[PDB]
Structure 1
């Protein structure tokens, strides 16, 4: 009894992990996940940057970060409106870093941006052009999370 049931439950658990993995694959597929590509998702809600990070973090993802023109357009198409990117110069003014760490490689700044305008701008938004503009982290923009390829 005991040992047999325990061995069976281990098989039940492994079967459940396999099924859940399959469910996640199907959901990613229905969400637009392209083979071997990272995918972006949004609930179309606009909120302050701190809430986007908290939200993507709960979902075990990160605030969307374009690493090249392709991904930049991908995020643009997903958001449809202005959306925060996982990039800020909160730590050292003028030095934009990825929220995931490290200095910005690819960038697509609008002319004369980032400019830390007025009272200050430490966050970044991809606008309805794919271009970038630094804006107040307190402002509310579309939440777009990123998940691994």
Structure 2
């Protein structure tokens, strides 16, 4: 079970899309939804390393945010953070309004303002058989 839609890339039981074009966080969410995917969720160092390999050098929106300003970071599939890869000093404690999460070229995570325009974003979905 590793068949991916055209222009996506397989890793383990998932397919990944590395979108380009300027978007704020929620706009990146809807872009992923338009291709029947979701902004990427990250649950293991293996997956992170795969993501770092293809990652846009200039920063990418990923599927983690401060749901309902609660303020716990929750993946857009409803899953919690088990694996994490924060940049040193991230996430910003409590709590400036940097409520959406981006991934640097290095692969490390940084909490950011949701209205920030980044030039990349990562979607995932389940691979088919």
Q: TM-score, normalised by structure 1?
A: 0.71
Residue of structure 1 in register with 2:71 after alignment: 94
Which has more radius of gyration?
A: 1
How many angstroms apart in 2 are the aligned matches of 1:69 and 1:137? 25
Greater shift in the superposed pair: 92-101 or 52-61: 92-101
Matches within 5 A, 1:137-148: 137-141=114-118, 142-148=120-126
Q: Which structure has more RCO (C-alpha within 8 Å, separation ≥ 6)? A: 2
Matched, 1:79 2:55: yes
Count of residues in Structure 1 that have an aligned counterpart in Structure 2: 123
Residue of structure 2 in register with 1:19 after alignment: none
Q: State the 1:146 CA deviation.
A: 0.5
Aligned CA-pair RMSD: 2.3
Q: State the 1:92 CA deviation.
A: 3.1
Q: Which runs of 5+ in 1 are unaligned?
A: 1-24
Matched, 1:127 2:104: yes
Q: Which structure is higher in helix share?
A: 1
Deviations 1:33-70 (A, max 9, x none): 24x53121123223101111111111110001111112
Q: Which runs of 5+ in 2 are unaligned?
A: none
Partner residue of 1:41 out of 13, 17, 24: 17
Partner residue of 1:61 out of 19, 24, 37: 37
Deviations 1:52-102 (A, max 9, x none): 111111111000111111211222223322111111013134311111113
How many angstroms apart in 2 are the aligned matches of 1:119 and 1:92? 11
Q: Which structure is higher in strand share?
A: 2
Residue of structure 1 in register with 2:81 after alignment: 104
Whether contact under 8 Å (1:116, 1:122) holds in the other structure is no
How many angstroms apart in 2 are the aligned matches of 1:78 and 1:124? 18
